A paper describes a structure:
The human SLC19A3 (hSLC19A3) transporter is a twelve-pass transmembrane protein of the Major Facilitator Superfamily (MFS). Among the known thiamine transporters, SLC19A3 stands out in terms of its physiological and pharmacological importance, as it is crucial for the transport of thiamine across the intestinal wall and the blood-brain barrier.
This drug strongly stabilises hSLC19A3 and binds to the transporter with high-affinity in the nanomolar range (Kd, app = 170 ± 55 nM). All of the analysed inhibitors bind orthosterically in the substrate binding site of the transporter. (1) Intercalation of aromatic rings in the aromatic clamp: Our cryo-EM data show that the aromatic rings of all three structurally resolved inhibitors form direct π-π stacking interactions with Tyr113 and to a lesser extent with Phe56 and Trp59.
Numbering used by the authors:
A (entry chain A): 11 to 201, 271 to 459
B (entry chain B): 1 to 127
Amino acid sequence: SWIYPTVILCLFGFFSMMRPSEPFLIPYLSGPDKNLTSAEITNEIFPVWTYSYLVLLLPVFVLTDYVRYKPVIILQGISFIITWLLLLFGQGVKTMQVVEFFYGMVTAAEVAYYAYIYSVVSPEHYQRVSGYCRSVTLAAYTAGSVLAQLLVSLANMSYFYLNVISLASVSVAFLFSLFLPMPKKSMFFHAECYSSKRLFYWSLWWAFATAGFNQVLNYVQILWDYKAPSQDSSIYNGAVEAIATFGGAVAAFAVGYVKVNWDLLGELALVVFSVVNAGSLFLMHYTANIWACYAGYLIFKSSYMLLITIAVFQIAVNLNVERYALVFGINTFIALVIQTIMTVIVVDQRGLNLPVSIQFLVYGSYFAVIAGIFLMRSMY
Amino acid sequence: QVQLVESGGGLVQAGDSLRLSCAASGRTFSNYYMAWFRQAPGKEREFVAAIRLSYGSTYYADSVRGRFTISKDNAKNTVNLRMNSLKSEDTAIYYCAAAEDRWALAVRTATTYNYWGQGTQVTVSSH
Ligand SMILES: CCN(CCO)CCC[C@@H](C)Nc1ccnc2cc(Cl)ccc12
Ligand SMILES: *[C@@H]1O[C@H](CO)[C@@H](O)[C@H](O)[C@H]1NC(C)=O
């Protein structure tokens, strides 16, 4: 009974996340077809994505619960189509800000994809199904990245046709979305945990690490363009992004497989991984070699996945399936608030308006500071 | 006191190119935003393109994006603006303005800049 909804949802997720154009956005936005500057991209366009995502998170969380998840998934597909149509045929900074708003809407509506399974699949099949819905999606992204590189290097395709392929993929995903079964019920509408100190502590670290990770991901490509201009040197953004995603997945799988007492070693290992993330970011900032910056990105992604897997495991050790949704919603909202504060202060034109050449110094300092503060409280 | 002086503007047949230069004097200019605005009769002052001297960051308006390029020639404390494929819609008076770099600086807002040039007129004639 679960096979049909599971298969349709996994097909939708795979085709929605298969986007060969994603790895090559900055070379595309700054290329001769859009002619946008790196300052405009980093300090005027990209920040909007956070703002909308913060604004649309809670409403969409409640809409998704009230109007059941299928409508929200269809809305996400429509948003994908509109976003990629505007990316393909949009021109100027204002159109790009609208594109960022719609992509933030897509990110906010992504919650329905992972909450849909609960209302259709029996509790018995939750775990495995979730795993599938996760595995598939990750593979899709990796596949797209690899394909992009294989098309950029061997097929000598243009960034425009990568966006065309992404548009076709999202259109197919939306068509698949139109065939998901209607959920009959919902967790909250159609049916105090933070008191525990451990839950609060682990959620705080999860939120801060997630904010840092998402801030670094939004501008890693701009940093790469700064170090290795795409208009004069060969770039390997697809291969690097595929390898980094694979390393992160392997790190998460290793965390899952190995059994160790995280109640005691968790703080030590998490501090060590935060220090490694800070060191990798410092290497990306200081190093003038592009290969060193790729290696730093790989290390940062793998270590952050090592971190977040343990954090999520510790948060979710005693939480129920129903409470997962609200706890993780609150944690992602707080992470978005932190990321929005950081963007307003640092990246936004109304703050320091720092270029990408100084932003990663701030990000490395941010991770080092998280590690330093959390190391405290040992004595006294 | 800062003094911005513009040169280069003139009568150019539609479709050609033209280079404008704004030289700033009276101070050491290393931490200023240098921007170009334009104003046409019966219209308001419009942002054209800005450059961050310290970092070299550049911003353009969508109307002139892809055609106008703003650079800096520090050897003479000048900021240049090269305009290619000029159209009749580019006829205006161009003012170069200088703003002090600082927290929360709105690059595209004319009120942000406290130093303005006398303006040089660029008229584009279509045969
Ligand atoms: C799955 C993508 N994510 C997680 C990576 O695993 C990172 C996206 C960040 C950056 C590379 N990409 C965008 C940043 C800001 N805005 C965008 C808008 C669009 Cl339309 C597309 C991409 C955008
Ligand atoms: C982008 O800029 C190049 C020149 O630098 C120009 O040839 C091209 O037409 C522009 N393309 C646009 C604005 O889409």
